[PDB]
Amino acid sequence: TTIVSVRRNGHVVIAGDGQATLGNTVMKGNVKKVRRLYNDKVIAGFAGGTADAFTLFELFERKLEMHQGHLVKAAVELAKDWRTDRMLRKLEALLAVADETASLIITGNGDVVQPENDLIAIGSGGPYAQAAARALLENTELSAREIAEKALDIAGDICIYTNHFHTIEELSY
Amino acid sequence: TTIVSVRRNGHVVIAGDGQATLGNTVMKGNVKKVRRLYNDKVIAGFAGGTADAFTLFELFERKLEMHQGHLVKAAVELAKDWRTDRMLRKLEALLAVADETASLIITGNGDVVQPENDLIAIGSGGPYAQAAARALLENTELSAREIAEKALDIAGDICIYTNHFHTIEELSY
Amino acid sequence: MSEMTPREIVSELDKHIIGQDNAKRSVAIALRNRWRRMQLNEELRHEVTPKNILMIGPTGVGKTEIARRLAKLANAPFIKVEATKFTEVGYVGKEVDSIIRDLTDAAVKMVRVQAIEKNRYRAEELAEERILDAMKLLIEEEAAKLVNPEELKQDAIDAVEQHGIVFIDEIDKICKRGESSGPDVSREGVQRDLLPLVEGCTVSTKHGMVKTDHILFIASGAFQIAKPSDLIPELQGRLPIRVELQALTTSDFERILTEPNASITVQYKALMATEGVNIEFTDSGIKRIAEAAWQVNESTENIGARRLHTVLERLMEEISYDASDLSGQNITIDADYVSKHLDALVADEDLSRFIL
Amino acid sequence: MSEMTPREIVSELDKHIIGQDNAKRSVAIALRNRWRRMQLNEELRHEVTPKNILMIGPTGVGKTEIARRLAKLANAPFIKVEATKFTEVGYVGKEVDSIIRDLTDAAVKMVRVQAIEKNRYRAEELAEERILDAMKLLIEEEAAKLVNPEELKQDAIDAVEQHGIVFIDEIDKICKRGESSGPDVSREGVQRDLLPLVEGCTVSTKHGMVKTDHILFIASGAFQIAKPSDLIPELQGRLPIRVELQALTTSDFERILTEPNASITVQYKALMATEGVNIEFTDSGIKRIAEAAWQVNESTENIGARRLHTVLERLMEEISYDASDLSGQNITIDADYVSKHLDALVADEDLSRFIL
């Protein structure tokens, strides 16, 4: 599994794989690990349990209603609900959400990480993806879509827990 | 990771690396691992999860002005709020705060240890940083900021879990 | 029934609320049908039930204001209830029916204040016939002279019966599917404790047994967490009208500042007059104002048009203290002033959370 | 009629409180606008809502003192409430509306105590007129024939309605932050059980139907762990004025000790007077005292100016017991006396926790 997201020029995208691996075999190898929210932008990927997710996800698309837009002033009273709170606690999920203002992360502890360049790479293929991505995002042109998708493909190629069915939501600003 | 502080002359400073580490690779390596409860003075650091670490950050923040600048008069009715109390335990962080009075350390459990000379050294490379810290803070006329910055570097240099993106606050007392 | 067609109900409502034409139209129908329906057969009398509106919108827009003035204009009784009170998660008690067992009082203490005039003059031309200390008492002593049995009694519920409006507040939050706040359904009980009210029933109170089979009901809430579809089903059906009010703009606060015919600024104006000073604000003075409110909202907690109120009084503090002095002078408030007493504040993320 | 501009309200308040001028002015404007508004159009007189103040500050500074004395000043009705009670996280009950069903009693039981000297003289020159017991009882009895119906209520309520003053206390205590004392919004409910009061409503009581539409409200709290922005939004809106009072200095203690026109030290004086003793309070005495207070506050738990009280009475302990003796003598309390009963005590800190 490898969730990717590169921001380039006018846009920022998130790519992901569809390989779901139970034990040493791949079941539904086409899981839509990357979803939007489309209420209005804010593309977020997800890495790990597909059950132990969604909750810690759509929970987002509601504060992204009140706090409207302020992804930032969203993760505050939002993300919080994951550590010192209730609802969902003690799982495994790395929802990589992307606004139009910045791409954050959450080590699954009501946490928040801001990638040194807004380049996100988590997953049993996270490093791999990163590396290729990083290598392009600075020695070629190619867009956020491209560089992301070309990198996820490189990830899937090295990581045996990652495949090639892709899913990507884009936008513009 | 290495939080350092070296009370010296009319000042006390806290330095820190910015290396966040997922297993055997490094994500956000520019982590603002040090901030100050801008309430005038009271600089602290953090060693561990970036998530929670924040809680014990604002936690202090408030108790301060009510317990009005009386730092010590805080950890009693403040720090404690970890061990017992019900706020939140079963976490991992070391907010190494410091007024213009003294520099303490909480192993997380509402604890509190104070360096034989106020030299604080925590983090993975925590020891290394202190070995240099002590060595200079004993054979040179160097500054509190210097001996720290100079130490955090030797640390990062020898500990594979600490890098060189620094971050350091200070003042004058 | 005081009358007034939908078009005419929106007109009045615009002298007070700016924008949100959608709701104004909306509550303008539910109101109209009253007038209509009451003109039909004894039949459809107990068949055509009210026409309740559910307002869905952010905080500050105008839901509650619309229904407050809509009442004032209907000259009917009105009462605002925080739906959650009756949730009293503190394990107490509270007959929902109390909601009615109040909208009667309001519509009672009213019938007596709405008659201090209805026969003021007449009763005073009597305070003459009887004369020509204790000169200002015989005025009051006419409180009996003036007829009050029956009419100013039974005709009183017919008010809290004709078309008095009950505006529930934050109906949402009383729903269940919320997660952030998803405790149980004892909450949803409050939903089921209202049905009598909004499905037809009679409650027993002091001045008499009143019936809510004809009360008009306006409930609100943001629905940030939950949807109107998450309300118990009975309610969904006894709530024909659904309207989404919009979030006010910077261009809206500029208006809410001067337009409405009792305006905020126009209040200070009259107010600061008592002290001999004459004030006047510049379009741009009033602009930065707005911009200020909008600023505090974005920057910290978004409360809405309500922010005008604080930002405003906060920028007239100086003037109002001094005011007694300044008499015979005409202080002018332009932007280079608004900023002079607000950019500071508004700039500080934290102070703004205290005095703005 | 009381009245008096903002400048005369800060004056009057200084005869009692030390410092905190920002508050006195701020509470002196909210006030003034009443008299201001009272004189306007039937319209605005029912539009310009009161002007509430939210006080933010440490314990022991004036918040509560300013408004208690701001009441006496206005001569109007006052009443202090702990917002916490109405939270009773036990599971009892406490109809907030009650807050009014008192500021009526206190505004009525007052009338009967405001009139025992409104016709005192009068009823007596008659309590001797029907005799030429003779004043022993016949006065009260005659004080029974002193025209008392109707007038009472009308005024009583219209005294509350006019401008009673409700000072909520420690409101900050009913907001919700995050960690520590972060139980649940049940609390935020107590916030919602108030809106009515602080937004316009009628409450039925013994003496009559009172309307809190025109009541002034002064809430407080230190806001140690919670900003006033964390208060339900409807309150943020009905709370136009914000003052942050400051922490009193030792210099303030020295002042609070002697200045105010009914000082504490000046009370002891008269008190030890009735015992023929005469006290003089040296400046350095008045000072070492302050230092005493300040010390116990820094050293142990910080209570505030309140401290003066204990530490002070703890200094005349000796004096007052003996006092009966000493008649015809003038005791002199100077620095090396204040310290002959303080230093060794204010120094143990633990004892300091029991008797100081």
Ligand SMILES: Nc1ncnc2c1ncn2[C@H]1C[C@H](O)[C@@H](COP(=O)(O)OP(=O)(O)O)O1
């Ligand atoms: N669109 C609008 N036009 C005029 N006044 C408005 C307004 N929106 C709000 N206000 C004013 C009137 C109210 O006294 C105050 C708060 O509004 P409200 O109707 O009580 O809020 P809401 O119904 O969103 O909870 O702000």
Ligand SMILES: Nc1ncnc2c1ncn2[C@H]1C[C@H](O)[C@@H](COP(=O)(O)OP(=O)(O)O)O1
């Ligand atoms: N600035 C001041 N000047 C004079 N007396 C003061 C004062 N601040 C406090 N006091 C006195 C009057 C009160 O009886 C006592 C406690 O103060 P308070 O006003 O009751 O407390 P607070 O308003 O902090 O809740 O101390």
